[PDB]
């Protein structure tokens, strides 16, 4: 819960394409923006011991095309929340921080102990858009 | 007879070079006749001196330069004597130049003759192509040079055998820009003849047939592209289209395919310029000419926004076929038009490999069996089909040259090529082709030379051994039409081969020495285990132990359908194979699984196997999720649907189908995440369309909900299209059928409004689907008026109306009442009149329906049916056969199908 340091927060661009049954559904290629950590954009391991970890969702819609310019409308509008079954801790982006020695946000499954799971929340259904792999534990970092 | 009377150009006149100066008029004259007038020098050597010289020039009057029509100038050692007269034979349409003076043997005479010709839009010779851009008609000079057409455009010694280097000076309006097979030797001259006339010199082409040479003057915009190899590619397209960028995908596709082909051929492309031209309307849709390839706009250009995945496939395949042609049949010259079937066949098979190279994910090779082999399976099965081999003697007239281009020639040729590659194991085949290309470059050639090279490569490598010579195996397949059926009894291992005719009773007039006994390459699996390849001899019956099985084990044949043949099994084996299929489809390969459904239905049509066995093949489809088996089944079931749609059998049939379709629809829904994650693979994408359409047609309430939601979404904000392009057609038709008049009107308004041909075509099909009788009648009336529907479009609209079951009766009546007006417009000029007759009578299975057809034929006999006359006889025969089926087997089939469907419900 304590943050030794609280000083960039990921934004999940959300791609939503309607099913055609009228049900809003999350789509592949939704982009969680990961800021450049030193040289590498994909993996951010925070220099700060603890993380603010705020989540921002931008809704984008595609008729069928890859282009997501069309704005999310009606049922399609959605918000993304990260809660993970795979990590032993539920980790719903809580102020409470559980363990960790090194926290990273790998976009690669290999080399990562557990994956934070971000789920788009729609009124009809909750669908997990992406798994954010995390090289996961130490007494030193809370 | 006379040498000019003979179609063939005399061998003695061989053209060393052609210098052609031509001035097309792209400005209408006082007469209004656009005219191409030019003076062309014929530089040629006479192997045997001939006083009379024969040139292939068609329908050209000759202007006189000073005193004579032909002025001959000889420089230095080369000497030329001016020719007194130019005459054209009416029978052969060939220019003959008559010179009183005897010619000097093997000397160069340059014959410059002024000629006058008229540019007419017949898509032949020198013709004009017109496109409306921004409301303005645009005039472009175009050359069709195939066969006799080259002669019409300019005097030439036209033969595949005759090869010349062509230096072209083109005088054209300055605004328009000239093109030729070769790069320009000299820049266009603004004021050389007149300020309006621009004269562009062109480099001498590498020696090639005159038909290969082409020159195009066009207003098309260009974005030049250069490969690392320095071949200049790019596209000629209208300026608005260039702004659209539709051609960009085609440009992206061409470069890798060229490189891949060059590696397989082992020869780099000789020409440093290859130009793809988007002709606004091209009847062929593609050009095989060396250097200059002109395509119809639809084939060449792909729009990402409004075009389906099928369209994307079309663009890649057509480009590959043409690229293959440049190396094959152009660099190594084709000896004569008779060898065209081989050239086209080689190109099509190679095109599939090239397309696969371009798109690795798509399994184009898997698609080849459905696209080519299955398509000609139907034509070959008919006894009337021609033998694949074509003799040089047979092809003489221009019409004969046109005859060689046919579906069997390209598609069957590709299938035989695939089989050949399999016996040669690919590498030897590639080596042979490469060697043949290098050895015979710039020489007219026959298939035997290529075959010898493949055989030589096989001779070099001892690792793979062929029991029979490559030429011998190939000959059996090429010489005779059709395919054998191999029947194997598991208990004894005996194998038997006989010809397959889809018709149960037919007579094959054509005679072959082989008598349909063919050497067959057999690949076999026993109980899931591969067996050593067996080469079947061309003998009716042989016994092999490997085929024999005991107890549980089952046998399979023709793995991957590499061979061009049907297969049959003993009934116990069939049952075992079917049982295995229910328990596990994995042991069977995908191509083989498709093969069993297709084969059983074909055998059922010929009555070799019972109708119930074919239905048993459909039983495992509940488990099957793959595209190829499902596609084969749907195609087979279409005949059943047409015959039983109005009968009582339809209700039970619908229930059985609903049960088989539902797991596939559900599986697809789950994989596609409720229809938004459309599958990337081409085969998978195609199956997604199949599932939606079949489900909607028979029951499946969930499908109806999806279609309704999608159409409603389209109606709001109509200009942007929510519907996925692959799925657009299904939603539109279904919605119109469920919907009332308001639905029909909305679609009609869109059909008139849409600029795109493809979109307009989709809308046109949807209009026919409406249930109400009155609506259909109003639509039928709309067609006659020119403003509402264009003439070419009218034939298609009538065909779709016949397809609707409620509409079938109405369409038939309209056709009888308005026959004369339609006949004058489309019977003349062969505008798919035969196709229109074929669309009617598709669903006709009753005696009463046959009687109506006979009456119409008698009543309108005096008026005449134009192109449709042959089709009318064919349509009547088809109807008779459906009723005939009822007389012998369909009455039983109707009862049985009902019983089988009832049991499976
Ligand atoms: C993909 O779509 C399937 C099928 O959806 C079907 O078509 C739609 C137009 C809707 O009308 C669906 O109701 C219809 O079945 C979805 O499966 C369906 O999920 C819905 C929503 O959870 C289920 O409805 C529920 O039914 C239960 C009955 O036990 C009620 O208690 C609930 O209140 C609710 O109404 C429906 O049973 C279920 N249908 C099937 C075939 O199981 C599926 O959710 C969807 N997938 C995605 C990616 O969203
Ligand atoms: C998340 O980022 C990815 C890129 O990593 C986005 O995918 C990309 O979307 C663009 C815009 O549609 C695609 O451009 C397209 O290119 C094709 C030709 O290749 C063209 O025909 C289209 O009109 C368009 O210009 C791009 O190819 C595509 N890239 C991939 C990897 O497929 C994705 O859309 C983003 N998602 C969100 C939520 O914004
Ligand atoms: C190995 O394959 C090559 C490729 O065809 C064969 O070489 C040809 O030899 C023939 C005479 O037999 C010539 O007519 C061709 O011009 C040669 N092609 C070239 C240029 O390589 C050779 O015959 C094969 N060797 C064996 C053992 O069959
Ligand atoms: C029959 O065709 C199948 C389907 O293409 C072949 O399976 C491929 O095998 C190659 C190598 O042999 C693999 O690289 C591909 O991944 C396979 N494709 C798929 C989609 O499975 C199979 O090899 C062929 N069988 C025979 C008898 O040649
Ligand atoms: C199609 O399959 C059906 C059953 O799925 C076959 O009917 C069986 O026939 C065998 C022997 O012919 C009998 O032992 C079974 O009792 C039958 N089963 C039932 C439930 O009727 C049918 O013979 C198959 N069709 C053909 C022509 O092989
Ligand atoms: C989405 O809305 C933004 C802001 O008004 C606008 O710039 C954009 O054009 C819209 N996208 C589409 C195509 O709906």
Numbering used by the authors:
A (entry chain a): 27 to 33, 35 to 163, 165 to 170
B (entry chain b): 74 to 978
Paste lines from the article.
In the TGEV RBD-dAPN complex, the TGEV RBD, like the PRCoV RBD, adopts a β-barrel structure with two ligand binding loops. Here, the open conformation of dAPN is identified in the TGEV RBD-dAPN complex structure, in which Domain IV is distant from Domain II; thus, the catalytic site could be exposed. However, the binding sites of the TGEV RBD are mainly located in Domain IV, and Domain II contributed little (9%) to the BSA of the TGEV RBD. For the TGEV RBD-dAPN complex structure, 19 residues of dAPN contacted TGEV RBD, and the residues (Q746, T749, and D750) of dAPN form a hydrogen bond network with amino acids (S526, S534, and T535) from TGEV RBD. Interestingly, dAPN, which has the highest affinity to PDCoV RBD, also has a strong affinity to TGEV RBD, with the KD value calculated to be 19.97 ± 6.09 nM. The Q746 residue in dAPN could form hydrogen bonds with A533 and S534 in the TGEV RBD, whereas the K735 residue in pAPN could only form one hydrogen bond with A309 in the PRCoV RBD, resulting in a significant reduction in affinity following the Q746K mutation. In comparison, the binding affinity of the TGEV RBD to the Q746K and Q746K-D750E mutants is approximately 16- and 77-fold weaker, respectively. The mutant T749R, which can lose the N747-linked glycan, lost its high binding affinity with the TGEV RBD compared to wild-type dAPN. Therefore, interaction with the N747-linked glycan is crucial for the binding of dAPN to the TGEV RBD, which also plays a critical role in the host range of TGEV.
To further investigate the molecular basis of dAPN interaction with PDCoV and TGEV RBD, the complex structures of PDCoV RBD-dAPN and TGEV RBD-dAPN were determined with a resolution of 3.05 Å and 2.86 Å, respectively, using cryo-EM. The dAPN, like hAPN and pAPN, can be divided into four subdomains, among which Domains II and IV interact with the RBDs of PDCoV and TGEV.
